[PDB]
A paper describes a structure:
In so-called “negative switching” green RSFPs, the on-to-off transition competes with fluorescence emission upon illumination by cyan light (~490 nm), while the off-to-on transition promptly responds to illumination by violet light (~405 nm). However, the development of RESOLFT nanoscopy in live cells necessitates RSFPs that switch efficiently even at low illumination power (to minimise photo-damage), display minimal residual fluorescence in the off state (to maximise contrast), and are highly resistant against switching fatigue (to sustain a large number of successive on-off switching cycles). It was found that variants engineered from fluorescent proteins of hydrozoan origin (jellyfishes), and notably from the well-known EGFP, could fulfil these requirements, giving rise to rsEGFP15 and rsEGFP216. To shed light on the switching mechanisms of rsFolder and rsEGFP2, we solved their crystallographic structures in both the on and off states.
Thus, when compared to rsEGFP2, rsFolder exhibits six point mutations (S31R, N40Y, S100F, T106N, Y146F and M154T), only one of which occurs in the vicinity of the chromophore (Y146F). As rsEGFP2, rsFolder is an efficient negative photoswitcher, both in purified form and in live cells. Thus, photophysical and biochemical data suggest that rsFolder has inherited both the fast folding properties of Superfolder-GFP and the fast switching properties of rsEGFP2. Models were refined at 1.45 Å (on state) and 1.50 Å (off state) resolution for rsEGFP2, and at 1.50 Å (on state) and 2.35 Å (off state) resolution for rsFolder, respectively. Upon isomerisation the interactions with the two first partners are lost, while His149 and the phenolate oxygen remain H-bonded, resulting in a trans conformation of the chromophore that is a mirror image of the cis conformation. In rsEGFP2 and rsFolder, on the contrary, no such reorganisation of H-bonding networks is observed and the structural changes are restricted to the near environment of the chromophore phenolate.
Numbering used by the authors: 1 to 65, 69 to 233
Write the structure that this text describes.
C-alpha cells in the first residue's frame, strides 16, 4: 500500500451512482448500482432512468456515470491519485463538447458513504440540436475502447485529462465527444500526484431481459499504463 486510500480497494466494493440531469430543459434522473474491483480493473453496473424515458442516448452518459476502480500495476501504485483521495473522495468535473452539437457540463463527487463507493452527479446539457445525433437518438448502442491520458495538476492538487470519445452513428458516421476533465480532492489530506500516464478502457453495453424500464447494463475494464517503471 502506498496510500491509505488504496487499502479500501483490496477487494470488491459495492457502488451507487446517482445522476440528476437537464438537457435542453429535459429533466431526468439515473440511478445505478453494482460493484467494482480495482485489483482486476472490472466494473459491473446496471443503471435505470428513474424518471421515465432517457432523453439522450445511454452511450453519451457512460463516461459521466469511478476511475478509482482502475487497475494500477504494481510499478504504478504511486501514480494513483484516485484511490489516494479516499475515503473523503474527489470532485470530478467535465465539459463534454459534442462536435457540431451541444455540450454537457458535469460535476460529480466520488467518495465513500458508509461502505459504498458513491458517484453523485449533476449534469447540465445545453445547445443541442433537436434533430441532432443526441436528442434525435441516432447513436448506436455500443462503446469503443479508449486511452485516457492523465496529467498532474499541481496547482489544484489533483489531475486533469482531455480525450475524445467516438460514438458510432446509425448512418455510419461518427459523433465526436471531446472531454475536458479535472479532479480535485474533497479533503485536505495528502494525495498522490502522478507522472504522465494513461488509462486503457473497454466497455460492453447490454440489456437486462427482465427489465422493462429504460436502462443500461455496463461491463467495463480499466487498466493504467504508460510508465516505464515506477
Amino acid at each position: 500500500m502506498v496510500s491509505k486510500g488504496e487499502e479500501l480497494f483490496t477487494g470488491v466494493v459495492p457502488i451507487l451512482v446517482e445522476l440528476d440531469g437537464d438537457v435542453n430543459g429535459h429533466k431526468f434522473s439515473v440511478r445505478g448500482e453494482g460493484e467494482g474491483d480495482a485489483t482486476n480493473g472490472k466494473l459491473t453496473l446496471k443503471f435505470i432512468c428513474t424518471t421515465g424515458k432517457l432523453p439522450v442516448p445511454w452511450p453519451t452518459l457512460v463516461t459521466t456515470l469511478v476511475l478509482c476502480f482502475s487497475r494500477y500495476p504494481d510499478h504504478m501504485k504511486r501514480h494513483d491519485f484516485f484511490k489516494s483521495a479516499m475515503p473523503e473522495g474527489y470532485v470530478q468535473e467535465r465539459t463534454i463538447s459534442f462536435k457540431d452539437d451541444g455540450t454537457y457540463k458535469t460535476r460529480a463527487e466520488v467518495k465513500f458513504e458508509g461502505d459504498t463507493l458513491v458517484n453523485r452527479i449533476e449534469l447540465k446539457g445545453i445547445d443541442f440540436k433537436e434533430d441532432g445525433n443526441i436528442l434525435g437518438h441516432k447513436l448506436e448502442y455500443n462503446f469503443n475502447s479508449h486511452n485516457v491520458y492523465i496529467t498532474a495538476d499541481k496547482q489544484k492538487n489533483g489531475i486533469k485529462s482531455n480525450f475524445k470519445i467516438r460514438h458510432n452513428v446509425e448512418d455510419g458516421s461518427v459523433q465526436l465527444a471531446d472531454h475536458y476533465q479535472q479532479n480535485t480532492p474533497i479533503g485536505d489530506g495528502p494525495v498522490l500526484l502522478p507522472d504522465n500516464h494513461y488509462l486503457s478502457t473497454q466497455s460492453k453495453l447490454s440489456k437486462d431481459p427482465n427489465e422493462k424500464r429504460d436502462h443500461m447494463v455496463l461491463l467495463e475494464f480499466v487498466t493504467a499504463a504508460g510508465i516505464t517503471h515506477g
